[PDB]
C-alpha cells in the first residue's frame, strides 16, 4: 500500500498450530543443512504430536511503524535569561539523533530509514538560586528557529537574524501546551543513511562515517522577553517521533556502549553474561534450599 496514509485494515495473525499425529517415513524435516545460509522452517507439528490451536495472537506492536513511532528525547540544552556571557543567552545545536542513546540504538537497527518526523519541544524555566529572590517576571515567551545549512547564524540574542523572514520559527509562551510540528522526509538522498563506510573526500580521507552525510542544519532558541531582574535559566528538550516509516537492511543491535556522537567507536565488550558451567541450570522447585 501507500506508506503516507493514517488508516489501513487487516489483522496480523500468527500461524495456527496444525494438528499432528504419529509418523514413520523418509520425511526428515528436523534434519537440514545450516551451511546453505537458510533458516529452517520447522514448526512444533514437524517434531512432536500437536493438537490444533486456533491462534489469534497478532504482531501489530512489532510493526516498524509502531516500534519507532513514539516521541523520544534526542536533545536538551540550557540558556539564560540574563548573563554576562551573551553566549549563554541562547541555545543552539546541530540536528541529529546521535546524542541520546535510546533513540539512536532503535534507529541503528536499520541501515537506511525514510520518514516524516513529528517534533515536540518541552521547555521549562527555573529561577536561579541567589540571596535576593523576590521579583515579578511576566510569562516567558521563547523563540525556536531552524537554520537550514547555509543560512546566516545568530551572534547574540538580538541579532537581525531572528527576524526569520524565511527560516521557520516557533514562538511559544510558558504554561501552554508544548510546541509541535511535522517535518517531511528532508534528505538529499533516497533514504536517511544511518551508517556510511565511506569518506567525504575522493582521495579516501577527510571525515569518515555518518557525519559526512548529515548536514541538516541547526536549531537556535532564545527568550524573547529578554531581561529578568534576577537570573533565571531555561532548559529546552526536543523530542522526535518518526512517522510514515520505511526501513531497509536490518543489522544487529548495538552491543557495546556508544563512546561519542561522531563515530561508531567502542571498547571491546563481553558477548553476554557468564554462568557457572555449560550445564548449570538453577534448582527452583525445592522445599527452599
Amino acid at each position: 500500500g501507500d506508506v503516507v496514509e493514517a488508516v489501513e485494515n487487516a489483522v496480523a495473525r500468527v500461524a495456527d498450530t496444525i494438528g499432528s499425529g504419529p509418523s514413520n517415513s523418509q520425511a526428515v524435516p528436523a534434519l537440514t543443512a545450516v551451511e546453505t545460509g537458510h533458516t529452517s522452517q520447522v514448526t512444533p507439528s514437524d517434531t512432536v504430536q500437536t493438537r490444533h490451536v486456533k491462534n489469534y495472537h497478532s504482531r501489530s506492536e512489532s510493526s516498524i511503524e509502531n516500534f519507532l513511532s513514539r516521541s523520544a528525547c534526542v536533545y536538551m540544552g540550557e540558556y539564560h535569561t540574563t548573563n554576562s556571557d551573551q553566549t549563554k543567552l541562547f541555545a543552539s545545536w546541530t540536528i541529529s539523533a546521535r546524542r541520546m542513546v535510546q533513540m539512536r540504538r532503535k534507529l541503528e537497527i536499520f541501515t537506511y530509514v525514510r520518514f516524516d518526523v513529528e517534533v515536540t519541544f518541552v521547555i521549562t524555566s527555573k529561577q536561579d538560586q541567589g540571596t535576593q529572590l523576590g521579583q515579578d517576571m511576566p510569562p516567558l515567551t521563547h523563540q525556536i528557529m531552524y537554520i537550514p545549512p547555509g543560512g546566516p547564524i545568530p551572534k547574540s540574542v538580538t541579532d537581525y537574524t531572528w527576524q526569520t523572514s524565511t527560516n521557520p520559527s516557533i514562538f511559544w509562551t510558558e504554561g501552554n501546551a508544548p510546541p509541535r510540528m511535522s517535518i517531511p522526509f528532508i534528505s538529499i538522498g533516497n533514504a536517511y543513511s544511518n551508517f556510511y563506510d565511506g569518506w567525504s573526500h575522493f582521495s579516501q580521507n577527510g571525515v569518515y562515517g555518518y557525519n559526512t552525510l548529515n548536514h541538516m542544519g541547526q536549531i537556535y532558541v532564545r527568550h524573547v522577553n529578554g531581561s529578568s531582574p534576577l537570573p533565571m535559566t531555561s532548559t529546552v528538550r526536543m523530542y522526535f517521533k518518526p512517522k510514515h516509516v520505511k526501513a531497509w537492511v536490518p543489522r544487529p543491535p548495538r552491543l557495546c556502549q556508544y563512546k561519542n556522537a561522531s563515530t561508531v567507536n567502542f571498547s571491546p565488550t563481553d558477548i553476554t553474561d557468564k554462568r557457572n558451567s555449560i550445564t548449570y541450570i538453577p534448582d527452583t522447585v525445592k522445599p527452599d534450599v
Binding site: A30, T43, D46, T279, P282
Partner: protein, 178 residues
Amino acid sequence: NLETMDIYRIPVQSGNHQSSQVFGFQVQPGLDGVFKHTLLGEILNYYAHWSGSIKLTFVFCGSAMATGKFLLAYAPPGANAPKSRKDAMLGTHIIWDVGLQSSCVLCIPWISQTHYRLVQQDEYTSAGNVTCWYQTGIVVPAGTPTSCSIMCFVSACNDFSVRLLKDTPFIQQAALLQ
C-alpha cells in the same frame, strides 16, 4: 570465554562420556545470558511480553569421518532439570544422528498456562529447560581429531509474537554528546 569465540562452541568428544551431560540451559529467551544478546533476545528486550515456539538448530562441526547420536530434550516446568539421560528422555526430545545433514532442529513447542510469558521471566512464567546427552557416543577412525564442536542457533517459529513496548536495559549513558 566472555570475549573469545569459544562461548559459541559446545565441546563434545570420542570415548565413554555417557554419564556426562553435554550441556543444558534455561528457556528464558529474553533474560538468561545464553539468549538475551541473541538476535531473538535483543528484540524481546524492547517488549515486556512474548509467546510462541522456538527453534534451536544444532550443527555438528567435526570431521566428516566422525560419527554419533545425541539426545536433545526439552522439559516443561514443574520439576528440576533432568539429572540423567533416563530422566531427560521422559520429556520432549529428538534423537539426532550425525550424518551428511550436518544440522538438527529441536523445536520447543509453546506449552504454558498463560498465552504470554514475561520477557523479564519469573517463576510464575517459567518455561523449562533443554539439556543434551550422548545417546550413543562419538566414534571416530584413526587419524582424525577425537574432539569437536557443536554450534547452536536460535530463532522464532511462525506462531511467535511480542507485546507491550518498553526500553531496553542494555543501553545507557552518563551524559550527552552521547
